[PDB]
Amino acid sequence: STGSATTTPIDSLDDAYITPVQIGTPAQTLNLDFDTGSSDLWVFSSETTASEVDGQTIYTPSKSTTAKLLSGATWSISYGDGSSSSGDVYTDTVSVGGLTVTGQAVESAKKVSSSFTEDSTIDGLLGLAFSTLNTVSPTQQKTFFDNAKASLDSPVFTADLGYHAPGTYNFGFIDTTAYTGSITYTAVSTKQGFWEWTSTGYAVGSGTFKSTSIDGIADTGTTLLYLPATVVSAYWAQVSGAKSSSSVGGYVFPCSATLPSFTFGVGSARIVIPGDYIDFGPISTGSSSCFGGIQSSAGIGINIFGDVALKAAFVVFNGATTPTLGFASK
Numbered sequence: 001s002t003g004s005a006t007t008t009p010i011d012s013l014d015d016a017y018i019t020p021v022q023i024g025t026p027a028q029t030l031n032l033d034f035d036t037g038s039s040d041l042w043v044f045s046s047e048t049t050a051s052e053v054d055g056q057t058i059y060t061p062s063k064s065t066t067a068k069l070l071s072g073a074t075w076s077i078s079y080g081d082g083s084s085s086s087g088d089v090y091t092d093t094v095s096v097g098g099l100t101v102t103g104q105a106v107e108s109a110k111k112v113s114s115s116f117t118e119d120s121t122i123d124g125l126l127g128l129a130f131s132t133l134n135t136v137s138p139t140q141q142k143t144f145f146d147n148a149k150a151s152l153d154s155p156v157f158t159a160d161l162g163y164h165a166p167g168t169y170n171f172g173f174i175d176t177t178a179y180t181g182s183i184t185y186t187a188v189s190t191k192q193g194f195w196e197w198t199s200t201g202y203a204v205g206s207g208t209f210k211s212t213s214i215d216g217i218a219d220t221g222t223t224l225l226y227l228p229a230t231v232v233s234a235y236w237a238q239v240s241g242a243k244s245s246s247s248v249g250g251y252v253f254p255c256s257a258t259l260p261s262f263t264f265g266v267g268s269a270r271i272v273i274p275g276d277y278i279d280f281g282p283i284s285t286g287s288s289s290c291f292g293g294i295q296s297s298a299g300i301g302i303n304i305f306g307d308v309a310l311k312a313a314f315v316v317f318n319g320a321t322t323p324t325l326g327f328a329s330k
């Protein structure tokens, strides 16, 4: 089996991407944020505290003939940005792009934090990191990908995110028409539950490539590229007027600037992030200070290859017995 679904930016900045997902019988279609940095599939639901729902589409398990309470199971998750959600759990049929899993754990939110309430376009998350991070207690649950894996033609999924445009998540096959050149594969550590890998270095604009190992995670659920302070300082030093602002919470730059590209290494291959991808626009409406798309990871405890990086590539998440990650230009 295979699946193929279009993923669409939620706003003009590509803050996140939503992918339609069919849950239950008859289908209830919710737009979920596919997140390779977490491992819970959770949804706004008929159980979500009413004051915490503001425009989202909800899953109503009582209207699904295939829903069953996973008795006694609860979940609670916190994300890197300080947001959180929690609730109880149903099993139900879940389909993505024509690929169906029966008995998928669908985590029904009873509570969500304000950032979730405020984002009317995101109806929940679909985690695609390793199932060892799943928060369901007392019986940990598997991700959609892990459940689907045995049925897939090949034990892989791919992320092809667009820059200010739709893109694609495929399950079970590699679309050889979706990238240019060859795919370079690199080793993954699953020790922290993430798609964790080591980049071989970087370049700023037309500058020379610096060979240096940068350990980080491929995280479709993080907007920006978070790298060591040394690397980030070297990038922003090439932009006149750029500075780190403690009041704003990161590097900002004059909106009149033209940003240089940023290259990261994957083995002996190179992925180039165009300068435009690093522009997140005014910090507030009408401001001439713009927020940068490359920020320091200092204090996070891990480097994060978020959407800014991933959208510059066709990315293969290879869930074979020994997982690997592949990157191609596109």
Ligand SMILES: C[C@@H]1C[C@H](C)CN(Cc2nc(N)nc(N(C)C)n2)C1
Pocket: 013, 223, 248, 249, 250, 280, 281, 282, 283, 284, 290, 291
């Ligand atoms: C780190 C956060 C902190 C809050 C207070 C302001 N924002 C400004 C801002 N402006 C813009 N344009 N884009 C972003 N992000 C993509 C995160 N954020 C940065």
